């Protein structure tokens with residue numbers, strides 16, 4: 635037995651309404667450019683979308699993006715979510731201007747908007763997540779640990795119904811942003827263009843010279859002399875031969891990575907949700923640049 639969560643469109647809303655919310659998110663991303671030593675909010679909004687979706691458990695349909703339960707203190711204060719409060723704060727004035735959007739739609743849309751405005755692939759997005767009460771908040775401990783190996787990673791993502799290609803594609807979002815010692819016990823960026831969505835994660839895995847070192851929090855991480863880092867779970871993608879093949883494919887085909895990531899990311903964000911046969915089709919929002927805005 636799993637719960638059923640049926641998508642229900644915010645009353646009377648359509649594509650145009652959500653493009654306006656997209657636009658407000660994108661404009662604030664542009665405006666608040668100084669955040670995190672001028673990386674900007676794009677990376678933390680992508681991580682917020684993934685962590686608010688990544689609690690899902692296919693076996694009983696608990697967790698997931700539908701209920702928007704990050705707004706409750708058990709989930710806000712999950713140690714795995716340390717740092718995401720910055721993303722939530724960013725989204726607060728968006729929610730105040732557009733109070734009709736559900737929290738789950740806002741957290742997932744923030745992720746879509748971030749990826750597209752950082753020049754990533756289009757991510758089709760569906761509305762209709764509905765806020766659920768505090769007691770539906772999943773317990774802490776459903777997001778992955780970083781200090782583990784490929785077997786861990788593979789098994790972990792089975793709970794989110796992701797296969798090896800989906801796992802490797804999703805991990806490419808680590809092109810974005812950085813680890814912050816005070817949030818996670820790890821420090822450093824994975825690459826140079828921290829706020830541009832590219833296949834750089836895979837090129838860096840394959841092409842940098844990596845050394846297993848201890849950081850200031852006494853945790854192991856792989857460091858390169860270009861000043862990049864990889865988590866043990868990131869590095870596992872080149873230690874496992876099946877993952878490694880996929881890493882090589884994405885390192886050598888930007889388009890393929892973009893298409894696979896778009897599919898897996900939408901999937902991640904939609905897991906657990908039942909869409910009525912007559913629900914609207916997925917929206918594909920225009921970027922500001924495409925709109926001349």
Ligand code: HEM
Nearest residue numbers: 677678681684717779780804807810811812813814817818
């Ligand atoms: C084995 C799975 C994964 C693990 C262990 C993991 C672990 C981490 C850790 C420890 C950080 C740094 C948090 C910081 O200190 O602020 C991080 C950052 C980040 N992660 Fe992951 N991650 C994984 C999967 C993913 C996936 C699936 C995505 C999205 C598709 C994602 C997107 C990000 C983003 C964009 C950031 C940078 C946030 C920022 O700069 O604020 N991660 N991740």
